[PDB]
Design a protein around this ligand. Sequence first.
Ligand SMILES: CC(=O)N[C@H]1[C@H]([C@H](O)[C@H](O)CO)O[C@@](O[C@@H]2[C@@H](O)[C@H](O)O[C@H](CO)[C@@H]2O)(C(=O)O)C[C@@H]1O
Ligand SMILES: CC(=O)N[C@H]1[C@H]([C@H](O)[C@H](O)CO)O[C@@](O[C@@H]2[C@@H](O)[C@H](O)O[C@H](CO)[C@@H]2O)(C(=O)O)C[C@@H]1O
Ligand SMILES: CC(=O)N[C@H]1[C@H]([C@H](O)[C@H](O)CO)O[C@@](O[C@@H]2[C@@H](O)[C@H](O)O[C@H](CO)[C@@H]2O)(C(=O)O)C[C@@H]1O
Ligand SMILES: CC(=O)N[C@H]1[C@H]([C@H](O)[C@H](O)CO)O[C@@](O)(C(=O)O)C[C@@H]1O
Ligand SMILES: CC(=O)N[C@H]1[C@H]([C@H](O)[C@H](O)CO)O[C@@](O)(C(=O)O)C[C@@H]1O
Lengths: 258, 260, 260, 260, 259
Amino acid sequence: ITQIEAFLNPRMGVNDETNTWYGFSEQVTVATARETDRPPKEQMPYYSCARIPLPLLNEDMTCNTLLMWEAVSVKTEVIGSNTLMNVHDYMTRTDNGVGHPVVGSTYHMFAVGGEPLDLQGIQQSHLVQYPEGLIVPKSVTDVTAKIQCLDPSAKAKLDKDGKYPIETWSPDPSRNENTRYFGNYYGGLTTPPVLTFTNTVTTILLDENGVGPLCKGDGLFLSCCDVMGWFTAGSGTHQRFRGLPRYFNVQLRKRAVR
Amino acid sequence: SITQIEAFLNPRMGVNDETNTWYGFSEQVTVATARETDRPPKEQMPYYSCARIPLPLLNEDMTCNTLLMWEAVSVKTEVIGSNTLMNVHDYMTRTDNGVGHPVVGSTYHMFAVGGEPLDLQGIQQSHLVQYPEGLIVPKSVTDVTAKIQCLDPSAKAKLDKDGKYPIETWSPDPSRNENTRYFGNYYGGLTTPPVLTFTNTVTTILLDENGVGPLCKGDGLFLSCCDVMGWFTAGSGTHQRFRGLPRYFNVQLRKRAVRN
Amino acid sequence: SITQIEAFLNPRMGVNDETNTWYGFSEQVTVATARETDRPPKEQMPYYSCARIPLPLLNEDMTCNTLLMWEAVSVKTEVIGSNTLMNVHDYMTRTDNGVGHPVVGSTYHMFAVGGEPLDLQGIQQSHLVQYPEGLIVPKSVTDVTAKIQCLDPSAKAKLDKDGKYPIETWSPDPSRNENTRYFGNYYGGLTTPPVLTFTNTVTTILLDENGVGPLCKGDGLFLSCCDVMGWFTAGSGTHQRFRGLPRYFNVQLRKRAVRN
Amino acid sequence: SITQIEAFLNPRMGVNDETNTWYGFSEQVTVATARETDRPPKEQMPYYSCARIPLPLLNEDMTCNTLLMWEAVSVKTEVIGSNTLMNVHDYMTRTDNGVGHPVVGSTYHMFAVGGEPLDLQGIQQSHLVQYPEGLIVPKSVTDVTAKIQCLDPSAKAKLDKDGKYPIETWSPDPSRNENTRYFGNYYGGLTTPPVLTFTNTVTTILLDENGVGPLCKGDGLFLSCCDVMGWFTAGSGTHQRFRGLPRYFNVQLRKRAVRN
Amino acid sequence: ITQIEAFLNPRMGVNDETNTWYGFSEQVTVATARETDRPPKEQMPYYSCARIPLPLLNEDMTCNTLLMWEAVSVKTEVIGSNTLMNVHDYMTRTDNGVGHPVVGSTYHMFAVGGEPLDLQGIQQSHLVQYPEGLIVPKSVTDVTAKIQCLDPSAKAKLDKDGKYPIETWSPDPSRNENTRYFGNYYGGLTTPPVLTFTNTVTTILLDENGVGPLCKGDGLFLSCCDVMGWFTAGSGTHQRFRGLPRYFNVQLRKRAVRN
Ligand SMILES: CC(=O)N[C@H]1[C@H]([C@H](O)[C@H](O)CO)O[C@@](O[C@@H]2[C@@H](O)[C@H](O)O[C@H](CO)[C@@H]2O)(C(=O)O)C[C@@H]1O
Ligand SMILES: CC(=O)N[C@H]1[C@H]([C@H](O)[C@H](O)CO)O[C@@](O[C@@H]2[C@@H](O)[C@H](O)O[C@H](CO)[C@@H]2O)(C(=O)O)C[C@@H]1O
Ligand SMILES: CC(=O)N[C@H]1[C@H]([C@H](O)[C@H](O)CO)O[C@@](O[C@@H]2[C@@H](O)[C@H](O)O[C@H](CO)[C@@H]2O)(C(=O)O)C[C@@H]1O
Ligand SMILES: CC(=O)N[C@H]1[C@H]([C@H](O)[C@H](O)CO)O[C@@](O)(C(=O)O)C[C@@H]1O
Ligand SMILES: CC(=O)N[C@H]1[C@H]([C@H](O)[C@H](O)CO)O[C@@](O)(C(=O)O)C[C@@H]1O
């Protein structure tokens, strides 16, 4: 059993660790028309991803029998729920009451994979104009009204950290044979966030046949996104997405393959 | 041994045409000004999705007293695109400089895997609704009285047309569907937040009490679903639209011998 | 040998007449102006549904010291018609150009399968209510005092008439019902969203801790339920109506020898 | 092997007199105008319910170094009367011509089965409350200081009087209760909807980790509970009353040999 | 099979048992600017922690084989949910209605370990100016915008009661090999609190290899925080954190180890 640890930082829009709003989005702006809907880069949450390099197993990749790393299980943890207990920051308040803590829509997902997470493109609006330096369904097909449902042409891989927006991309259930993904979504404008944390819980990654993800290229592929909802600064009614970092501890073993 | 079949079924929220700019939503919902004048346009209601997937022919010769049928053993299913509701920059209602108000309200989730069409039982919130011609509704199969507000045993149909059987008039019939497995949940309210989980690690077993999965008559696999996520509100108004999401099915099939 | 019995029980929400245009609803709920003049009309309250299903006669002679009884071993039950609550185009209250306000409020779900009528315990929110002629209420079996607001052990009855025992005055008696299995849940509030799951894949075992299911006295299967989904609000005003839904039962029975 | 004991415990919501017209409720709750003049009348607070059920004498001679004790091995418990909260026609607050506002607010549920009185730990929201004469409160057993707002280890008592130990000053003591099993849940809020499940099909095992149930000292079985459902608001005003419900217990016991 | 039991009092800001607001914070003040955000120490909740001394097991610590106390299981309980059923105190009310009970954000965590709990620094705002005598990320590292996500340098041990604020410190999932920790968080301004209590539930502390926390220096390390939400006195709209005490009953055995 080989243990691999990693923390993936949230990519909430302010993805630069020198910027004072790191781990939040920039203030979210809202379209004045369907056809003029143009969100800046910094105002949308992204999938976080990392390829962790694994020890080289085959001193010759020509042999018809090889060793590949198998992900057998994962302990994962969203850290920092405790930060949202801060209600003395410069936040909206009612009379002399506490600062209004982060609330709204929540999006939790992690994936452990032997290759990049397969993504399927889908959108709330076909008419959105995404900025430059983002991978969105437009990058791979003709975005029509079909993208508001299932357009089987809208396929991609999560290979760039902080560049694939959650709002255009779902884990593709029709692929991801070599990846396990898990997520949940809870909507609403002001819904309270919920989180549980413990170091006592292991997720088994073996499939129906006892085969974990197999790490192509001696690469272990971690993906996630942990939106806690919106923060509101005491400066106004403008809101920012707030995300938290995710810990991964993956257990691997060597598996012989043809 | 095990044959994998997969399919995506797209939502039928009333804008059922993939050329239309509001595909995957209803048209703006209108409300009756009287019980007796209640006439929903067909583009303003959500429908059951359904697809008959053709399977490989198993029997060269149908004279044979022993034949093979495809047996649905398990299904991995997945409502895709909960992530799209994290879009709050679209042209939506907002409070001051706050984010766009996301999709909220009543949720209706249902899926079925069968070896024939899903059996439906007619039931309505109002017996006085006038449905457009071209929809299959309780009127289509029996005389509609007040009885339809409860259980009218004569109001039986089969889900045999995609995007034409409205959810508001049809429930899966639990007194039939011997050769289908169905699963659903409903959460009401006007502004209830939507909830969804997704994973590719979860298999639902379709074998009945006797270890028999759905058996695919005519070498067809019958998939059906509806996935209403609630109501969208465009920043043009207070008019609301149903929002649905597509559903993946990956059904595990094996060959089952049957006496002919 | 497993014999199957299936039945639908229609809700008794107050409009218990299948010819009435508000069947499956209550009449408009009125509210007392004083604790001492609290007089609810029969049509304004939800009732327990119940039905005795006749079973095949088993014993040609009842003198015999060994007899067969039908034993209920399991049940598949389903509340039908959650899909009807996805109708928001009816003549209903609305906010601006938004959808009709769907059914919301207090929910009460219960089902029972027994070999005799459900045992009831009388209990009331107010001892001063004056119930109308035609209903079976604690006053029918005992002297009603303030004790009826807690547990009055005199307030005993059997659920032997469909749509005449108001839910508001009768609980399933946990001190009796040796020969019945009952199940239920309650969720209060004025505007709480209703919740429902449905499937044809879930069986409830009726065998007690001794391996014995309900034994059908007089070759009768006793089915009981109530399925209050909340209150409907017509677009004519702020007046509200209870809304209930029908329940399906599929009971698996076997013959069980008994000593007499 | 098994002896069955059954009992109902009525709620002690502050109107603890079965001849009072508000039995099963509190009197109208009053609120302090200062921390230092906070004086709740006894009828305005809910209490623990308790009862000792006598059990057959097993030991004719108490000098014997081997004796039998009754061991509680399991319990079926039920909160009765959630159905009564479906009454929305009583003289209750209402919005326009809507139904009466049903019971909502904070819920506190607890039950305990023990071979002696339940051990209580004193703890308070305010150390400055002045409790009326005739109640057992932390003041009865120790010096009440600000320590009582957290854990004051000197604030120890035994639930030995029905309707006299206010729930707001007393927790089940997890440092004692070796010879008791207790279970509870709390759900706060001013207007939270109440939730209840009921069934006669569920048994809770009372055996500890070493397979030992409560052992009935003095051949008594000690039942305790509290079942606050929230607040009732009469149509007379905005004054509220605690509303509680009775709890049924059915305890299974066996004889166990012990060493004196 | 040895039994340890302890009550840990909450450290909600009024950490002083002589103070009339023991078990609550002082009234919470809110920053008027990101850069002047200075929380007085009495207005934040802290981790509670204690070290329970255990019997000495080894005469000679030089030996290559020794006995350590092993934590196999714990019964834990938050006490005092019943106190929140008091709606007659001097509290906000609507008309002649009951006092508004404690509502808002809840934070529950407990930990049982063979050494102090490992903490990872993380903040909602890198710009907060923490008062004197608290241990906060800046106490151990260079605080920058990195502290708003995961800064690997922000590492500490929960070694002082009522001095590590919950809003700066998460249990570190990358350490705590010799600790089990459990927690849950539920946000919102007015969310109803929820609590279950029973004496019938045991949590197993053995890891995947069947080993519990092993008590270094014959000390058992208990950590917790139990914030129930905010109280609002009838004097105004000013709020106080409200916390509750936590009971621990830890079962220990002797385990032989290779030194
Ligand atoms: C549950 C109850 O007591 N209902 C009353 C009802 C309501 O109080 C009222 O409709 C408000 O919702 O009042 C009823 O009519 C009454 C007459 O019988 C009486 O002569 O005059 C009363 C005037 O206060 C009152 O209108 C009704 O609507 O049916 C009687 C019913 O029992
Ligand atoms: C919990 C508490 O202290 N209750 C008080 C109560 C309330 O403060 C009041 O009803 C508002 O809800 O006040 C009581 O009556 C008091 C008199 O005894 C006193 O002489 O004058 C007071 C006026 O400032 C007040 O009316 C009451 O209603 O019973 C006493 C109770 O302890
Ligand atoms: C968390 C924080 O920054 N708290 C401030 C506090 C609050 O901003 C204020 O009470 C609103 O809730 O302000 C404190 O006092 C301040 C003075 O130090 C200053 O001279 O003037 C300030 C306003 O301009 C304010 O009065 C306080 O109330 O304790 C200080 C605290 O850090
Ligand atoms: C999603 C979207 O279309 N955003 C646009 C916003 C908003 O319309 C307004 O800020 C109202 O929130 O306007 C801009 O001028 C801006 O501030 O950058 C352009 C930006 O593209
Ligand atoms: C469900 C229903 O009856 N809708 C009817 C609507 C609504 O009453 C109004 O638009 C108010 O919402 O009125 C129409 O003229 C319309 O707009 O198409 C006819 C339609 O039959």
